[PDB]
């Protein structure tokens, strides 16, 4: 979104945004200033005619807290790879999971949706994850036009290394964000004009900690079946996804859901003067939970609008109307049941 | 200011500095290497004839500690807003308080003065603060030429969220850096040529934590009345500020002063070969302290010089001559009474 | 490696890399994803005919862990200084020690070698260190053509300031990363064409903490004698270093070695299609250890290759074959005795 360097086959696109955001909620753990900013580089070098190396980095820096505070910045994306002209591409690092190739069609809300809802960050291959080799391929080895296919492999990421251990690595992490040797695949196709369909499947080994430290979720493998449909035409965005996860959807902080049925659907209209009203519904029903029965993990209706000044400046307002009923599951799992109203003005370069 | 991008009405300025700095002092909590660097972007996009969107970000990175060290970087500024041609501007994020619109006239020392002295970072609206909606207006609605006035509103920033609570928010902070819903206004005018006067007023509700956890300072509202006069002409810089704060000036680490009288005054001369000697006096007399009574919170005379090679490179040396007498107040408040000698060489892009 | 701004005597180079890296090892404290990225600026300003100011900054950002993790970024380099055209240069900040001016000729391995092996970060003047004033001089005061000489002084960097103290500073650090008032000098000369020789000497005071808290290493001064020989021509790189350190080489985590003999030797061939196989041997034999005696601190054989697509993209594989025998010294010092295999694809801008 801003190419600051272009010389001798090297281009360096420097992109990002400064989002001044504020939340209103009864939940005083999200209430207050939420002003953040993202910044990153997006460079590539040309090697020959049908070979181009590239790298990307996306850094997230929070700016709603004081300078006395700690751990206020992290790396969202960081990978490097090669482009084989048309035969596809290959990249490795911290990148989006292949399941996202479908789920991203509903991550189009003014502020909400996406991470922290039906899926989350470091949740196997459902979003951003560490050490993922992703082979993407445009137009299925040239065979089928418009058929974008992808394969992904993820390395084992266990607990913090030390005495006690149990499948440790150098990048040891919290119990809910671990993952074993996993793989995944995505597949998107434009069936008609403006209409697209997609499918994604992921399977990762689970570690001992995810069957021990937390109470919810027991099983050897974590699987995700994902399907999506997107209509983007006539100033209409209308998308829906659906995911059946097995030992893979987070149940707050208690563990994982042995069986989960995520479902997102969003509708937006784009005006000619720059107003984009958006209405969505997200739900995630968890089945066969250890202890509890069949419970709702997430359920809310979104409504809001985004006013676009131009390709760089915008402002937005969002309303999460939480439909979750307070029961014994949300009390100990720590799942919020309160409505939230977001209000933001973001500059974007 | 090194403008690295300018294309199609969008500009991206990239500014900052790398200050290699060293302190000499009896206070062994500031003596030693102090090498820091700041870096940030200053971009803007043009929307229409009388509307321009902009954003700013300023990042501070310390470089005096080892690679093992923690919490060595923070965000000084990060906001986004709109400039209405002549009718003014409106911005939201982490920005400078309106009181700084005046007191900054004495934050012109080779290294000392300004933040961390009479006021500090996140000290209500006296300096940098989180979540401030600032409506500035150049030339008083076109009515009065040269009268720059500003209005500011600040959202509630409480304690860490959890059990116990007491007015919490998501950006919860230490008791001395909290603030409730506050407002403020500034007013600066160049009466003659080179002579300027200024006024600033801030009023924020104080939170329960600031009347409980720390001992000094009790009250419901925190107010700051500030006035300043600056003469900048004929190679003469001569400025003075003065602030009466009520439940707003930090008394080191003990709390706030129920009544405080901050006063800074600085005089500098600019030579033709790039040498700028500077002499200042900063004091902060605290009145009505719980226990201690009437004590001095800060009191020192500054003397030093800055040699400017050009508009980008410079070097400086400073001498803080602390006039504070050692008593029980400085012992419990953690207020330093020792002289400091700064010595720096700064590259600036 | 990418000059984004160059106008009116000011140039602003923007360099760095995005290294997607993965380790395989029995030692499950280094195994797993290691994807890191470095990014920094390399600017300079022109002052007059024989005076040019410059500044440099190098930031290391880890991206192998989750966003929940802490302390994943640090500053490798950050300094500012003046270039006297040809008469030399002077810079201060966090910069490379003068001993590296020699040892860097063997830190040319595909991934391993350098920091964390025979020397380390913040290990007196053997690598990067805080608060170093470095006066370099190109072509020895005009006397001798081609003779690069350097002098460096380092300020005292002790423990964290507080009650108890014992030589404290504001940038207080871990016991093994401390350093007193030190100095050093390096001297490199190209004797033949492609053949170079170099010598370096450093002497720093040790603090009370390094003779008290840890058991190994006793003495008042820490000294390093370093010598190096480099042959770089005819697609042949062949270099060797040798260092006798006294109270200066780390003996893992037990303290310092009263006598250490570091020795590195590397041989590489550069093909015409971009393959650079490299074979090296690094060892560090420690003599006169408190309690143990004569032990091996480091000893392994390196073998690997770096395939260069071009000057920006590359991929590599490395093999650290550890020759260390398991004994009580490696048991208490925490020194790894396991083989490691690195595998990386790095974009470089």
Author numbering:
A (entry chain F), B (entry chain B), C (entry chain A): 0 to 348
Provide passages from the article that reported this PDB entry.
Carbapenem-resistance in Klebsiella pneumoniae (KP) sequence type ST258 is mediated by carbapenemases (e.g. KPC-2) and loss or modification of the major non-selective porins OmpK35 and OmpK36. However, porins play important physiological roles and facilitate both the influx of small hydrophilic solutes, including nutrients, and the efflux of toxic products across the otherwise impermeable Gram-negative outer membrane. The overall structures of OmpK35 and OmpK36 display similar features to other general porins, a trimeric architecture composed of 16-stranded β-barrels. L3 is not exposed at the cell surface but folds back into the barrel, forming a constriction zone half way inside the channel that contributes to the permeability properties, such as size exclusion limit and ion selectivity of the pore.
